[PDB]
Amino acid sequence: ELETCKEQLFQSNMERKELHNTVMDLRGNIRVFCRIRPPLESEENRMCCTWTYHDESTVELQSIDAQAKSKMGQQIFSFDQVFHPLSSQSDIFEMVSPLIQSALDGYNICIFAYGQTGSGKTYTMDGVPESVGVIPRTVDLLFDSIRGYRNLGWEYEIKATFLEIYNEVLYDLLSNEQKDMEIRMAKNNKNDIYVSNITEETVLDPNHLRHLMHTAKMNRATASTAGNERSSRSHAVTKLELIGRHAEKQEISVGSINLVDLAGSESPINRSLSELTNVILALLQKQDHIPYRNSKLTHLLMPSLGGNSKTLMFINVSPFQDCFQESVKSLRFAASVNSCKM
Amino acid sequence: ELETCKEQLFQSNMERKELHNTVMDLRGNIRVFCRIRPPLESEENRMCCTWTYHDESTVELQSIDAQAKSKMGQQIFSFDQVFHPLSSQSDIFEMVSPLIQSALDGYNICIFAYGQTGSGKTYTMDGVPESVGVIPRTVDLLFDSIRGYRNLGWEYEIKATFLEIYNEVLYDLLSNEQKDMEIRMAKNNKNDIYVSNITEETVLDPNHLRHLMHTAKMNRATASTAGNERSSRSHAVTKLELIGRHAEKQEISVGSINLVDLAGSESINRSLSELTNVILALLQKQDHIPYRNSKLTHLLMPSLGGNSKTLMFINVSPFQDCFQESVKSLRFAASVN
Numbered sequence A: 001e002l003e004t005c006k007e008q009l010f011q012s013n014m015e016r017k018e019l020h021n022t023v024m025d026l027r028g029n030i031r032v033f034c035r036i037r038p039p040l041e042s043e044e045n046r047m048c049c050t051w052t053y054h055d056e057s058t059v060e061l062q063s064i065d066a067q068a069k070s071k072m073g074q075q076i077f078s079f080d081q082v083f084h085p086l087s088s089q090s091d092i093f094e095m096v097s098p099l100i101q102s103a104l105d106g107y108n109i110c111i112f113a114y115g116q117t118g119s120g121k122t123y124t125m126d127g128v129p130e131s132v133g134v135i136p137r138t139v140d141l142l143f144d145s146i147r148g149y150r151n152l153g154w155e156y157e158i159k160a161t162f163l164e165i166y167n168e169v170l171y172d173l174l175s176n177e178q179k180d181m182e183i184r185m186a187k188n189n190k191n192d193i194y195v196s197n198i199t200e201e202t203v204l205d206p207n208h209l210r211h212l213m214h215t216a217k218m219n220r221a222t223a224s225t226a227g228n229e230r231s232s233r234s235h236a237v238t239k240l241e242l243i244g245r246h247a248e249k250q251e252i253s254v255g256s257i258n259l260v261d262l263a264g265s266e267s268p269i270n271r272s273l274s275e276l277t278n279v280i281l282a283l284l285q286k287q288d289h290i291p292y293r294n295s296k297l298t299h300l301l302m303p304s305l306g307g308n309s310k311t312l313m314f315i316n317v318s319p320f321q322d323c324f325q326e327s328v329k330s331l332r333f334a335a336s337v338n339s340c341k342m
Numbered sequence B: 001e002l003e004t005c006k007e008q009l010f011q012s013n014m015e016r017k018e019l020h021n022t023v024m025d026l027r028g029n030i031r032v033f034c035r036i037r038p039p040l041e042s043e044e045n046r047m048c049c050t051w052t053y054h055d056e057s058t059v060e061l062q063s064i065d066a067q068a069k070s071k072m073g074q075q076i077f078s079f080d081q082v083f084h085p086l087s088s089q090s091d092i093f094e095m096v097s098p099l100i101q102s103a104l105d106g107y108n109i110c111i112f113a114y115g116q117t118g119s120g121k122t123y124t125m126d127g128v129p130e131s132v133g134v135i136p137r138t139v140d141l142l143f144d145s146i147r148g149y150r151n152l153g154w155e156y157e158i159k160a161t162f163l164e165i166y167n168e169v170l171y172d173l174l175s176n177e178q179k180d181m182e183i184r185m186a187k188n189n190k191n192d193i194y195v196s197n198i199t200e201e202t203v204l205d206p207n208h209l210r211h212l213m214h215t216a217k218m219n220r221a222t223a224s225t226a227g228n229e230r231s232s233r234s235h236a237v238t239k240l241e242l243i244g245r246h247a248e249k250q251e252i253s254v255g256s257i258n259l260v261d262l263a264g265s266e267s268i269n270r271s272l273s274e275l276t277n278v279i280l281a282l283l284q285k286q287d288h289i290p291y292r293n294s295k296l297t298h299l300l301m302p303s304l305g306g307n308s309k310t311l312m313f314i315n316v317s318p319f320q321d322c323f324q325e326s327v328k329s330l331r332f333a334a335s336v337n
């Protein structure tokens, strides 16, 4: 008879699962966001732009130059939402926690931080000890959720791997034992991908994972020091694969989260950056063929840009005049996107 | 030990509830549908119209009068869905069943069948012993759901009341004791309404209620028999009130289902017209809704409110001679969304 609790507990969750993917689907599946960051004490003598916020999801930006102002015309863009200099980390996390539950439910996620250097990706994805980013929160939420699922029969296992992509070249950031990795078809799924030779530790709790994350950062030997042309010009893919198994019932749940702290989008490899973009738009257009294998980064995420996959995308921008010319570019991508979702 | 687990059930269900309403919301909350009925053996020599189906949620009608249709511009309308002559009762019910869940979760529902006489309203809401309508299936679905809910701690209680509105006059279809009934502010909710003197039976199962529905139908002894300007000119409000109580937790769930079998739409109309206004008035987020301008809009005031969910069926006849009317029916729909 208590089977009727556990069995119906198995059933309410099954229904909860569909309502949620349905909500997810109507809401989007490929949402684009914008994040604007407050200027720093070391930029108090820096020139801004004029941020006009027409409604909670649209924003127009204008060059404080009254002269150039004439030939530029208009600069107005909308998104599924917009975050302004007073928007907290916890704010941005609201837009993400749902996708986290989708992964536990068996769907692949992809959160990308994108923008020109200085914009705020690293701050967004990782954050800082004072105000943690998406990844740190994602982990806590992940372990909380997992904890509960036990009472339902599901035993979850997390499998983390951390790497970097610098010039169409992959780097395990968990080992210094310099090897040669390759993106290849997963043995039990020609559609899933697998990286050969990566360190794939199985997280034991927020701790063990915070560590691993630290390690990955160090081994990144982040020479943001001298000629940093490296870190600001390379992709950082953190992947957590969630494997849920229900014995005495069978069937498993497999969903993966891919937290990409993208390279800076500025100008004078871009092989990926550009390629990544094409792929994204190519989907929105239900295009027949997506060039996933045209770049190490799209090949690697191929299985999470798929059909049921859900993608977040943050465009970070600096509220500064000198940036402006870039700041606009970052947004245009956002504008070119939603023009396809039409 | 169950006290750590079953609580997760009340806790789980709770979240299902929150999500369903979220889906309901994005979907609509106020959806307008369209049903076209196929011609009968007694209409084989009747003139149809040109039913163009541009996509599964849009359709264009046209006067076979190459003469008239060349003088009108067009005849095109889209709904949240459209059902054609081949659409079954079970099809329509799929559009409804979700709202039945909302009811049990504590929201107010309203299903309206609407159109010119002879279009399909009575068929849709009540149906026939062969192909039952929305109301019959709502009761079955309502009792199944209830039956499972027990295991979650909730005890549900249904409370039916059937009435008719003829000329801004309310008739209790469950008693022949001819009394005077009034619409007034509920005691424990000034926004809620309560009719005085209505028989309010507490349904015990599909039977008890099917019975009551029959009674209600007999006690309707309309003039459709001898002077149809009656039945086909009055409103039939069936109302099931769902009250769920969770003891050893407190908290109750109060929701109602209002099944309205509207009166013919051809140009009394005090209500039918008013009803229309009110509907549209909501889609426009208007400041003040004139709920008390008609007997129907005042009875349903609480089930058209904020959270409230509303389904609107516009039945139409596939006939040339109905044409001019069939377009008016669709214009209302053209303005809703």
Ligand SMILES: Nc1ncnc2c1ncn2[C@@H]1O[C@H](COP(=O)(O)OP(=O)(O)O)[C@@H](O)[C@H]1O
Pocket (backbone or CB within 6 Å): A036, A037, A038, A115, A116, A117, A118, A119, A120, A121, A122, A123, A124, A232, A262, A263, A264, A316
């Ligand atoms: N939202 C913010 N609030 C406060 N400081 C921020 C914010 N966003 C970015 N910063 C600051 O600037 C730095 C973050 O780097 P970032 O702009 O993420 O990299 P890139 O755009 O080169 O990938 C941090 O040292 C942090 O103090």
Ligand SMILES: Nc1ncnc2c1ncn2[C@@H]1O[C@H](COP(=O)(O)OP(=O)(O)O)[C@@H](O)[C@H]1O
Pocket (backbone or CB within 6 Å): B036, B037, B038, B085, B115, B116, B117, B118, B119, B120, B121, B122, B123, B124, B232, B264, B315
């Ligand atoms: N979908 C249908 N399939 C078969 N018969 C139908 C259908 N719709 C309506 N009818 C028929 O016509 C009658 C229904 O009346 P109705 O058109 O609902 O009323 P009004 O439009 O006057 O409110 C029934 O006797 C039924 O046989």
Ligand SMILES: [Mg+2]
Pocket (backbone or CB within 6 Å): A121, A122, A123, A231, A232
């Ligand atoms: Mg950075």
Ligand SMILES: [Mg+2]
Pocket (backbone or CB within 6 Å): B117, B118, B121, B122, B231, B232, B264
């Ligand atoms: Mg009728």
